[PDB]
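To close the section, here is one more complete example, presented without commentary so you can practise reading it yourself. The ligand is 43B.
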Amino acid sequence: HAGRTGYDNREIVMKYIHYKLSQRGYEWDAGDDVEENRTEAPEGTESEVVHLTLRQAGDDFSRRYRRDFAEMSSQLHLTPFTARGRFATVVEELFRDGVNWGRIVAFFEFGGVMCVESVNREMSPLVDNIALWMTEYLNRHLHTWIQDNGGWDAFVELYGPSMR
Ligand SMILES: O=C(NS(=O)(=O)c1ccc(NCCSc2ccccc2)c([N+](=O)[O-])c1)c1ccc(-c2ccc3sc(CCc4ccccc4)nc3c2)cc1
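Output:
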């Protein structure tokens, strides 16, 4: 009794972040389990529509705010110990009062911003860790907000591309 797409907070973040790194050409060792996993074929026209919307959603945002999160990035600093604690401290501010499709878009960007921050130095593997925490906060907050507010289909339906 919950759609038939199987959207996974982990997968969505893994794809979005995976694309961000692709732009640079970094073969992010995401699917460490590279043993040919079919299960039910890669075909996912269902979650495919939102994959583009959500993927493009962040891009359009980053282009609008090119002097907000970029600066705060310097505050994050560079370290594996504080990195994990800094993430939660940042997202916490993303939604002080309440959550909304409008604010969540910034959520994805954050991960990508902090993710690349590690790659810039020499902590590519860390990119995987970030995604782990991202899904936690997204599933522990957003998920509940989206699930109660229609769901994923809402975002894509509300913010749908031209025609299709
Ligand atoms: O305007 C906003 N939302 S909206 O009006 O409801 C909207 C407007 C357009 C679209 N879509 C249009 C097509 S693409 C697009 C998507 C989103 C926004 C703009 C365009 C969408 N949406 O798709 O959900 C939502 C909006 C504006 C500003 C912020 C915002 C501002 C300062 C900060 S600081 C921070 C720390 C986390 C943090 C750290 C690092 C980086 C980011 C955030 N996060 C912030 C987030 C957050 C949301």
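Once you have examined the tokens, check your reading against these statements. The domain at 1-164 is CATH 1.10.437.10 (Apoptosis Regulator Bcl-x). The first helix runs from residue 9 to 22.
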